[PDB]
């Protein structure tokens, strides 16, 4: 109760509350899913309407021709971090004329996100990202936290009620690799479906899809672009 | 200038002329070229006069600060290092050619320091525009471990050769003798040059200059 | 870090500045320091706190500082803080002389320091200068002048004022005797002794305990003079003759 | 990884007192007693250097320090703080000599040192010095004795005492001080003022004393202290 | 260890009994994390780490607690993984600066001293907090032999024959004291490192775990390498067989 | 007492949360996005008849195609509006084109969390901005309306209300607003809803109205222009 | 100047002349151009007297601290690397032709050349300075693989004497230094001691 | 009044009502956290340092466990207190010593090196941003002018020369042992000095040391080089004490 004001204060339990409270912002944000195959990496995101008369808030952002991100938490911290990711990618192509390897970018985030968690009067980045990428080592799904820790994932979901989406991905993780692009997206939004309360389901309004892979560069599908994937709505049982 | 130094049996003798020049005209007939560094170390200076004065005063100041902290008598190596590292840092733009000499707990030490920051440690050194003339005397007459009076004669003869041969040098010969227990700062050691007596009278008498305005201001 | 910060440049809920006000309490402990403006000149008269038998007396003064060729000041508050401000005042006065080749006018010198003192109340997070100053001077714009400074950075011109110990009781005592437009340095000094004698804790009042300086105009140039031992002794015993005369 | 606080650690209390300065004054009051006496012929500075163990080497550290060839210093309170003020005063004396080619006047040095002491009462992230200084000097054919306290205020003294039992020390001095005593006598009364606030009996290695006159400032040798100590 | 009306809020503040609690709480962070060990053999150093999997959705190789600091230096971490990675970056940079200045591979004892000085610098101020990470450094040279060091949150550096950091550090050290490492070959050590980890691992309280192994020695030509899958899988087979 | 960058146990920044509370004290503002253009309305809330109503400007133009309505601590918006104006002109200078409504909104939104204590510049922001902004403009993607809050979150709205009475105004828009209504209906609807929630009686002086449309530039409604729409009781 | 260093089995042999010139005047006819940096590490200085001296003094400081901190007898390569860094970074400001030669318990006797550019190369023998020009032919004709310590001393003394004979900016006295495991031993050659190769004409 | 506190005078380096600095006083108790004791004795032509060497287990490489440090070729020290703080102070001492020789042309005196460290320690005692170093340094060396020197500097910034000293847990008990021994007029030979150092640490802990339980560092007139004894040579002195 007196250790939770700064990042520089260790608690008697060996914990830092400011880093832990920053992680709460990821939970408070809207749920998103990310999964990969042997060729494609797909991000599916659930958009939120602030007061269903305003448009559903943006969730998937461009980083490079081969990297795209899904956000959860503070939007302003998400854009700030995205600009960093965009900058490091542009730097790589300027100097080496080759795409920056996903893993290397993620570890650059791990160093940048650490710096503030150790200086007085600073705060952690109140945003968790799901990075989808494709390079020489194939498709990638990465997760970043307010704690500068990052994870290499077979499949991942973060946000509100993401636990139910995580358990679906747990069940169907043995099918993701040999499976095709059209089936991957279906598995992705079927996990995102599980987060929603039993009343409301997926629509052209509240779903965003980001895809990057072998043949195609990172593309965002939003409104009318998302309907080919919804066409094939398996319907929800419980 | 002509400045020179010698290491003898008991310590160090330092010598210098007293001529300062601006252009090809003598500015000062009697200027002090042997400078105080510490009660046991003195330094001769040649080249840019103002550079000579300020460089020699700064290091003297810095050594006093050093010797107060240590409580010990300062070393000639410290004087050497301080002068060397400064003159180098200024890439030779401080035009100070120096003859450094003193007596330590280590013994008698003599240095020549160049404007660019190069040092030499030698039994006899000469600097200045009259250095060649002074160095000639040393090469011809210097002997190892000579007596104080003999070393006084040698250095003075070297300075004399610089005076009577280098147009940049003239007037009085100054000496500084430093040993393990004594220091002699002999200001006018020799006066080999004097102005001829004015046997013609040109004293301008009272009322020979026309005045236009006069104001007298009284004081305390 | 913010735990150890005492926030010196912050606002009170009332709408005031605590550190300034607390600095003002410090001035009320320093020696009684007063100055009054006359027609033929202007003077400063201060209570000396350095009154110990074993003191040496090296300087011409204790609390009277000379700032300019035409200006002088006295101090009430923390002595060390005063030495900072008075040195700065000398610098400000010289910068003006460097720039315009004329002496700095009394207001311009006061305001310059006051802007520095104000800065310490608004930003920086540091304690204010615990000093109030009285300024006496002459310029070709307003002639003989008397000014007053606060830790807040506030300034004011006065015909007669007092700062320091028993400030309130001395001002009402000044209101009683001061006559605007008809005041002379002769009577000004008499008033100065009158106020200090009553306001000070010592009821005898020796020359050792007071310090008086006068700023006059002698044939073109300005004369700042700190009064000698016997000159003060003469003014004090003259006041006693007027005190014993009060048997009417 | 280092930074530095910008806010003052010394502030005005509700009663208008700078608490940290008065607490630093309590620090000097608990320190070893020291005495200074002007003698219209010279100045004497003498201080208690009561060691503790004899294992300590008496000649290793000094409480009486020379600032320059004509100025000396003694303190009461904290050793480490004093040493900082010594190096700072020595630098200030050298700054003056580089510019004017003339030994710094004692009054001019004290003012410059007091300013540094003043800085540590208003500057950010620092505490004041827990030291009062006794500065002696000889310039313009006159002896000088000054005191500089934690706040940065300075005073000219004929004779004064500071440290432990300074109140009794001063009362002892005003009864004993003559404004016409020579240096030899001044040194005698200086040791006597220390004797009043000592307990344990004095040796030449038990106290430290320095003198200042027309010949300059120097520390008195243990042989010279012993000779005066035949009370 | 109690009083905390201040004292324990800043690393620039001592407790009345002369302790810096912020460093001690930083040490608590490494005490809560899973165990990591390293053993100095006759011809090199072997590292072993119990990597707890939070979710089966993470790829095998994620949250790697083994690092390559230099081509000849290995690093095993325990505690807060964020700090661990940034300390690895510092170690990387210190090692490369040495090569760029002096032309050869940085000696481990010098690298360990340099990094520990950096660690220590974070224990002195209120502006920064100490690292919640203990790390081990291993290297092998033909001229220097096998070398193993460990640095804790305080900045203390010591050479080890065997060392354990993490949740069951005291429990692990009792198992390493049973081994004659000075006479052992680093091929045999891998087997023994795996065994100690499996023993120390809590089967019921903690979930499943992945075993990470690396080595540097004569067998690996002085280069720090990850232990090959075929040798790692052999040691896991052996470690489970020890659980009779 | 804590720093300005301190997270609450819920995962929000105290100063940012309290900055949102400041809007709830500001005068209410309505923006409606239609096919024919964008209209912005705001109450002036005059406290004295001696105060000039023409000097209270809560709707300002950023460029010819972009207008902005503001609510909350008006003084704070000075910088945000100025930065938006500089961004539009810098873009023209470099790219010879007008900035999109989204681009401007995003540029301003980047400044929202640019506050802090330690590790700061010689003039960095000490706290969030206590204002909410409504960006109404027209570009290639037709006419759009964007809403920014102190947190930095910007989003397109069909119709949005910000201010002290944004509670009843938002629910009132969800009744009247049809996604194919005209601009005349939009202006009519907004002024009706504005007078429903205002404490003072609505007239042609205590309110401000502006429209941007694909046909013509940002237009500020004068007294006479207002009288024309106010007349509908 | 002329400077020279030859590597043998158990260490190195260093040699230099003693002339310092300020134009066409010998400012110092007996100069110690062999500068000690550590116990077993020496350097030969040619070029600017002030420049080389300052670098030498900085390497001594840098290597001094490095050795204590590393707790090893310093590597000759390391001392040569400290010279390289300085001679390369400030190559436009300095006029320094350095030869670093010494002994260490790891690699034995070593001779490194750092010319004016700031490059570094290990050599069996190295020569530098203005006078080294006149002795390239002799040094290439005389040098033999695996010379003993006493032969290397003769080899350096001969080469230098020939160089001082022809070069105006070289002369005075030959200074020799031998460094091996046991330590450093110094000798000086005066007048008669300098190998006489008689004036060879009609 | 004794034991009084005002504001944050027990958290940062600001004065207490008595005029004390509690944070510095707490830094002295931080020296005793190591649990080790160091003793230094000065002889007629030598200077001896001795410390406890507590290696708890087989797993620690005992060659790395040390509190003896070389600063210069002629100056060595013993560190008592927090280990990480100690290392830092040594690296700074090494820096100042090398910088001195480079600037002044001669090697730094033991006298002057101790002063410099104590001056640096003063900065931490006046600034609130950082804690003082919870450690104590005892330097030894042969001064080329004065002879053997033993100097010690505090976290408070006090420094002094000594005939003999101690630091750590059993400091005040072993300085009391050294007082008695120094008052007795011995012939302070190398043998006498080394043995007085050992027996001081031996009787103050009641242990009777094995060669692996203590570390000894010496400096002599015949060899000014700072030297660490090794177990073989320590044991030689230990077997000689069987009298
Ligand atoms: C002999 C006399 C030179 O022939 C000595 O070197 C002497 C040194 C000396 C003299 C008096 C006090 C202390 C030491 N040098 C001079 O007398 C010197 C000669 C000189 C002139 C110009 C130079 O060009 C850079 C270098 C040396 N005289 C002066 O310094 C005179 C008084 N001042 C000037 O000429 C002004 N200069 C200074 C340099 O910048 C250009 C203007
Ligand atoms: C031989 C003699 C000539 O090449 C050597 O290289 C020798 C190197 C040496 C000298 C002393 C101690 C160790 C090693 N070089 C010199 O004697 C040198 C010649 C030189 C002058 C200027 C240069 O340009 C930067 C390079 C080489 N002489 C000096 O350094 C003398 C002491 N100083 C001057 O000549 C003064 N110069 C400096 C440069 O500007 C013109 C005036």
């Amino acid at each position: 109760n007196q250790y939770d004001n700064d990042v520089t204060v260790w608690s008697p339990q060996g914990r830092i509350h400011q880093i832990e409270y920053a992680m709460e912002a990821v939970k408070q944000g809207s749920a998103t899913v990310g999964l990969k195959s042997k060729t494609h990496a797909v991000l599916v995101a659930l958009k939120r309407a602030q007061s269903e008369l305003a448009a559903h808030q943006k969730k998937i952002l461009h980083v490079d021709n081969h990297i795209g991100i899904s956000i959860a938490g503070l939007t302003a911290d998400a854009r700030l971090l995205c600009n960093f990711m965009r900058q490091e990618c542009l730097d790589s192509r300027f100097v080496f004329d080759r795409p920056l390897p996903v893993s290397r970018l993620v570890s650059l985030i791990g160093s940048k996100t650490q710096i503030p968690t150790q200086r007085y009067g600073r705060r952690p980045y109140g945003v968790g990202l799901l990075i989808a990428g494709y390079d020489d080592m194939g498709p990638h799904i990465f997760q970043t936290c307010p704690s500068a820790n990052y994870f290499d994932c077979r499949a991942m979901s973060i946000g509100a009620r993401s636990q139910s989406a995580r358990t679906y991905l747990e069940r169907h993780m043995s099918e993701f690799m040999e499976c095709n692009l059209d089936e991957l997206v279906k598995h992705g939004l079927r996990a995102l479906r599980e987060t929603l309360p039993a009343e409301q389901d997926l629509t052209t309004k509240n779903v965003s899809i980001g895809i990057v892979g072998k043949d195609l560069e990172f593309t965002i599908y939003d409104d009318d672009d998302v309907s080919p994937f919804l066409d094939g709505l398996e319907e929800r049982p419980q | 200038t002509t400045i020179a130094g010698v290491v003898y049996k008991d310590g160090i003798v330092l010598g210098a002329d007293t001529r300062a020049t601006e252009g090809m005209v003598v500015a000062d007939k009697n200027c002090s070229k042997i400078h105080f560094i510490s009660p046991n170390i003195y330094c001769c200076g040649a080249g840019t006069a103002a550079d000579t004065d300020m460089t020699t005063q700064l290091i003297s100041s810095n050594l006093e600060l050093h010797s107060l902290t240590t409580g010990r008598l300062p070393r000639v190596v410290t004087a050497n290092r301080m002068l060397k590292q400064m003159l180098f840092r200024y890439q030779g733009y401080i035009g100070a050619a120096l003859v450094l000499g003193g007596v330590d707990v280590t013994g008698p030490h003599l240095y020549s320091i160049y404007p660019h920051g190069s040092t030499d440690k030698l039994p006899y050194v000469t600097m200045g525009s009259g250095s060649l003339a002074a160095m000639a005397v040393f090469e011809d007459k210097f002997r190892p471990d000579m007596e104080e009076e003999e070393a006084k004669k040698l250095v003075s003869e070297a300075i004399a050769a610089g005076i009577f041969n280098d147009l940049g040098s003239g007037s009085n010969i100054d000496l500084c003798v430093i040993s393990k227990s004594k220091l002699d700062f002999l200001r006018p050691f020799s006066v080999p040059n004097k102005k001829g007596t004015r046997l013609g009278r040109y004293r301008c008498e009272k009322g020979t200059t026309a005045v236009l305005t006069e104001k007298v201001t009284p004081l305390e | 870090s913010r735990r150890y910060d005492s926030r010196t440049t912050i606002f009170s809920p009332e709408g005031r500045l605590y550190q300034v006000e607390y600095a003002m309490e410090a001035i009320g402990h320093a020696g009684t320091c007063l100055g009054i403006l006359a027609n033929d000149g202007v003077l400063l008269a201060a209570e000396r706190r350095n009154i110990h038998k074993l003191l040496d007396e090296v300087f011409f003064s204790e609390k009277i500082y000379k700032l300019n060729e035409d200006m002088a000041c006295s101090v009430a508050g923390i002595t060390s803080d005063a030495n900072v401000l008075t040195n700065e005042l000398r610098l400000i006065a010289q910068r003006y002389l460097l720039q315009y080749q004329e002496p700095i006018p009394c207001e311009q010198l006061v305001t310059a320091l006051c802007d520095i003192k104000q800065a310490y109340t608004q930003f920086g997070g540091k304690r204010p200068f615990g000093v109030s100053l009285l300024y006496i001077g002459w310029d070709k714009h307003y002639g003989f002048q008397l000014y007053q400074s606060d830790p807040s950075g506030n300034y004011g011109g006065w015909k007669a004022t007092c700062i320091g110990n028993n400030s309130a009781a001395a001002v009402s005592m000044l209101k009683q005797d001061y006559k605007e437009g008809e005041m002379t340095l002769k009577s000004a000094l008499a008033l100065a002794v009158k106020v200090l004698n009553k306001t000070m804790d010592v009821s005898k009042l020796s020359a050792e305990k007071v310090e008086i300086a006068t700023l006059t105009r002698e044939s073109g140039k300005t004369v700042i003079r700190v009064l000698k031992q016997k000159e003060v002794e003469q003014l004090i015993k003259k006041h006693e003759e007027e005190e014993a005369k009060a048997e009417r | 990884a280092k930074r530095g606080y910008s806010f003052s650690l010394t502030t005005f209390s509700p009663s208008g007192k700078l608490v940290q300065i008065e607490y630093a004054l309590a620090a000097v009051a608990g320190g070893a007693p020291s005495v200074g006496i002007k003698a219209a012929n010279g100045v004497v500075l003498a201080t208690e250097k009561k060691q503790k163990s004899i294992l300590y080497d008496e000649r290793s550290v000094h409480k009486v320090e020379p600032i320059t060839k004509h100025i000396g210093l003694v303190y009461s309170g904290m050793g480490p703080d004093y040493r900082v003020l010594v190096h700072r005063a020595r630098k200030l004396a050298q700054q003056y000599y580089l510019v004017y080619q003339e030994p710094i006047p004692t009054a001019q040095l004290v003012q410059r040192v007091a300013s540094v002491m003043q800085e540590y009462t208003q500057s950010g992230g620092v505490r004041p010095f827990g030291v009062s200084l006794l500065i002696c000097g000889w310039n313009e054919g006159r002896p000088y004795l000054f005191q500089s306290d934690p706040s940065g205020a300075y005073f000219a003294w004929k004779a004064t005492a500071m440290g432990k039992n300074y109140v009794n020390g001063k009362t002892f001095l005003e009864k004993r001080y003559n404004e016409d005593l020579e240096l030899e006598d001044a040194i005698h009364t200086a040791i006597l003022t220390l004797k009043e606030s000592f307990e344990g009996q004095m040796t030449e290695d038990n106290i430290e004393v320095g003198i200042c006159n027309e010949a300059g400032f120097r520390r008195l040798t243990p042989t010279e202290v012993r000779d005066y100590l035949a009370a | 260890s109690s009083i905390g009306t201040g004292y324990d809020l800043s690393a620039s503040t001592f407790s009345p009994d002369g302790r810096v609690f912020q460093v001690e709480y930083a040490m608590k962070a490494v005490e809560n994390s899973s165990t990591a060990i390293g053993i100095r053999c006759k011809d090199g150093v072997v590292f072993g780490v119990e990597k707890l999997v939070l979710s089966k959705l993470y790829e095998e190789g994620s949250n790697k607690r083994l690092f390559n600091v230099d081509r000849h230096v290995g690093m095993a971490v325990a505690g807060l993984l964020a700090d661990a990675r940034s300390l690895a970056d510092i170690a990387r940079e210190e090692a490369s600066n040495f090569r760029s200045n002096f032309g050869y591979n940085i000696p481990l004892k010098h690298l360990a001293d340099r990094v520990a000085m950096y660690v220590h610098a974070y224990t002195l101020y209120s502006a920064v907090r100490p690292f919640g990470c203990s790390f081990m450094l291993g290297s092998y040279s033909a001229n220097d032999g096998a070398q193993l060091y460990m640095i804790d949150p305080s900045g203390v550096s010591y050479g080890y024959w065997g060392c354990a950091i993490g949740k069951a550090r005291q429990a692990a050290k009792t198992e390493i004291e049973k081994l004659q490492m000075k006479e052992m070959t680093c091929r045999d050590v891998v087997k023994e490192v795996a065994k100690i980890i499996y023993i120390v691992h809590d089967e019921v309280k903690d979930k499943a775990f992945e075993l990470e192994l690396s080595w540097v020695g004569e067998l690996t030509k002085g280069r720090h390498e990850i232990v090959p899958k075929d040798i790692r899988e052999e040691a896991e087979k052996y470690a489970k067989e020890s659980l009779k | 007492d804590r720093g300005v960058n301190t997270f609450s146990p819920e995962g929000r920044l105290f100063q940012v949360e309290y900055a949102i509370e400041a809007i709830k004290l500001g005068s209410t503002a309505i923006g409606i996005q239609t096919s024919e253009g964008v209209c912005l309305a705001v109450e002036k809330r005059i406290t004295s008849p001696l105060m000039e109503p023409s000097s209270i400007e809560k709707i300002v133009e950023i460029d010819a195609h972009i207008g902005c309505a503001m609510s909350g601590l008006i003084a704070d918006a000075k910088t945000l509006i100025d930065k938006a104006r500089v961004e539009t002109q810098n873009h023209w200078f470099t790219y010879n084109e007008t900035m999109t409504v989204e681009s401007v909104t995003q540029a301003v939104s980047n400044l929202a969390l640019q506050f802090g204590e330690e590790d700061a510049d010689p003039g960095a922001m000490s706290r969030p901005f206590g204002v909410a902004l409504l960006f109404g403009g027209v570009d290639e993607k037709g006419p759009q309306l964007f809403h920014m809050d102190p947190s930095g979150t910007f989003v397109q709205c069909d119709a949005r209300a910000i201010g002290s009475a944004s509670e009843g105004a938002q629910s009132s828009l969800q009744e009247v607003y049809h996604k194919s209504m005209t601009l005349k209906e939009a202006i009519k609807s907004s002024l009706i809803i504005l007078k429903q929630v205002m404490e003072e009686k609505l007239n042609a002086t205590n309110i401000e109205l502006a429209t941007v449309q694909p046909g013509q530039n940002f237009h500020m409604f004068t007294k006479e222009e207002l009288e024309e729409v106010i007349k509908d009781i | 100047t002329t400077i020279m260093a030859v590597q043998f089995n158990g260490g190195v042999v260093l040699g230099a002349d003693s002339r310092t010139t300020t134009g066409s005047y010998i400012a110092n006819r007996v100069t110690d151009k062999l500068t000690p940096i550590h116990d077993h590490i020496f350097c030969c200085r040619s070029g600017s007297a002030a420049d080389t001296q300052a670098v030498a003094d900085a390497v001594t400081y840098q290597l001094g601290f490095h050795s204590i901190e590393l707790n090893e007898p310093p590597l000759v390569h390391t001392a040569a690397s400290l010279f390289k860094e300085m001679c390369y970074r400030y190559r436009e400001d300095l006029m320094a032709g350095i030869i670093i030669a010494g002994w260490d318990p790891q690699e034995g006797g070593q001779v490194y050349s750092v010319p004016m550019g700031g490059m570094m190369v290990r050599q069996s023998f190295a020569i530098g300075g203005s006078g080294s020009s006149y002795i390239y032919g002799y040094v290439d004709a005389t040098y033999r693989e695996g010379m003993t310590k006493d032969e290397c001393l003769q080899f350096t003394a001969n080469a230098l004497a020939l160089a001082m004979e022809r070069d105006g900016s070289s002369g005075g006295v030959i200074r020799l230094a031998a460094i091996q495991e046991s330590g450093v031993e110094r000798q000086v050659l005066l007048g008669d001691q300098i190998p006489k190769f008689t004036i060879a004409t009609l | 009044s004794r034991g009084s506190s005002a504001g944050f005078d027990r958290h940062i380096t600001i004065f207490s009502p008595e005029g004390r600095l509690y944070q510095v006083e707490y830094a002295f108790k931080a020296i005793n956290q190591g649990g080790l004791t160091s003793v230094a004795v000065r002889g007629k032509d030598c200077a001896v340092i001795v410390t406890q060497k507590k290696v708890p287990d087989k797993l620690l490489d005992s060659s790395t466990v040390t509190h003896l440090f070389k600063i210069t070729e002629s100056i060595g020290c013993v560190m008592t207190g927090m280990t990480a703080d100690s290392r830092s102070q040594v690296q700074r001492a090494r820096y100042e010593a090398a910088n001195w020789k480079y600037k002044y042309g001669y090697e730094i005196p033991v006298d002057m090196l101790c002063k410099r460290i104590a001056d640096i320690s003063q900065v931490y005692t006046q600034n609130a941003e950082m804690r003082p170093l919870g450690c104590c340094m005892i330097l030894i060396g042969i001064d080329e002018e004065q002879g053997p020197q033993v100097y010690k500097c505090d976290p408070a910034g006090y420094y002094c020369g000594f005939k003999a000293t101690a630091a750590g847990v059993k400091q005040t008990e072993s300085t009391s042992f050294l007082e008695k021994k120094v008052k007795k007029k011995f012939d302070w030979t190398f043998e006498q000095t080394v043995e007085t150092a050992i027996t001081c640490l031996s009787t103050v802990l009641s242990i009777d040391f094995k060669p692996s339980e203590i570390e000894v560092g010496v400096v002599t007139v015949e060899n000014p080089k700072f030297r660490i004894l090794t177990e073989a040579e320590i044991d030689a002195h230990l077997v000689a004490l069987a009298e």
Side-chain angles (χ1 to χ4, degrees), chain D residues 1-151:
Chain D
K2 52 266 163 68
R3 197 186 172 90
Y5 300 149
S6 307
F7 54 85
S8 271
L9 300 183
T10 303
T11 53
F12 290 91
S13 63
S15 71
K17 312 302 282 295
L18 294 161
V19 205
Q20 277 301 306
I21 293 171
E22 280 169 46
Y23 284 7
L25 278 165
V28 36
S34 50
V35 61
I37 305 162
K38 192 192 87 73
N41 172 245
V43 202
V44 55
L45 297 173
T47 186
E48 183 183 295
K49 200 185 179 175
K50 208 170 192 292
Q51 212 54 63
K52 190 198 293 292
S53 189
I54 274 82
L55 291 173
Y56 295 69
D57 208 329
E58 301 84 33
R59 70 181 83 255
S60 59
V61 191
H62 301 284
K63 290 165 98 277
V64 187
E65 298 277 10
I67 270 59
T68 178
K69 268 76 197 294
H70 74 290
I71 296 168
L73 247 180
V74 179
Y75 80 103
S76 282
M78 302 197 287
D81 286 36
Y82 162 72
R83 212 149 28 83
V84 172
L85 294 167
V86 169
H87 182 253
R88 194 71 169 266
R90 283 171 180 168
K91 271 185 74 185
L92 284 160
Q94 291 308 314
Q95 283 171 27
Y96 187 98
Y97 195 80
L98 283 169
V99 171
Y100 301 105
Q101 292 292 290
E102 187 186 35
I104 183 162
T106 315
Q108 291 292 301
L109 184 85
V110 183
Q111 287 168 148
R112 284 160 165 87
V113 179
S115 293
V116 183
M117 299 190 81
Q118 193 284 327
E119 280 191 49
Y120 281 77
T121 70
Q122 196 170 25
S123 205
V126 287
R127 57 157 184 85
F129 293 102
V131 164
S132 291
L133 298 172
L134 268 176
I135 304 152
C136 74
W138 179 283
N139 56 101
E140 213 82 8
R142 197 195 184 278
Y144 289 96
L145 178 71
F146 285 90
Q147 184 186 133
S148 190
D149 55 33
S151 70

Side-chain angles (χ1 to χ4, degrees), chain C residues 7-94:
Chain C
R7 332 272 173 156
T8 58
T9 58
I10 211 163
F11 263 120
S12 161
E14 300 283 319
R16 46 199 183 89
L17 306 161
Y18 279 131
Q19 276 299 314
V20 178
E21 288 190 18
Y22 298 155
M24 285 255 64
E25 294 294 319
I27 276 85
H29 293 115
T32 305
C33 187
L34 59 92
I36 79 109
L37 174 70
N39 291 320
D40 52 336
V42 67
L43 81 306
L44 286 168
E47 176 197 345
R48 303 212 293 123
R49 255 72 203 279
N50 294 336
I51 43 91
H52 203 281
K53 179 176 152 76
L54 294 166
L55 261 21
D56 191 32
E57 193 74 36
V58 171
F59 305 98
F60 283 92
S61 176
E62 175 190 308
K63 305 225 265 91
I64 312 290
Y65 297 90
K66 194 188 173 189
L67 306 176
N68 192 22
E69 209 76 300
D70 302 328
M71 216 163 311
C73 85
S74 193
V75 159
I78 288 96
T79 311
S80 76
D81 291 15
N83 296 313
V84 173
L85 297 169
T86 54
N87 195 247
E88 187 61 48
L89 283 156
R90 290 166 180 177
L91 278 163
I92 296 168
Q94 281 307 125

Side-chain angles (χ1 to χ4, degrees), chain E residues 219-235:
Chain E
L219 214 282
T220 57
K221 287 177 187 178
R223 181 163 278 106
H224 183 259
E225 288 168 16
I226 190 158
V227 177
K229 194 182 180 178
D230 50 296
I231 308 171
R232 178 171 67 251
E233 212 160 316
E234 184 204 53

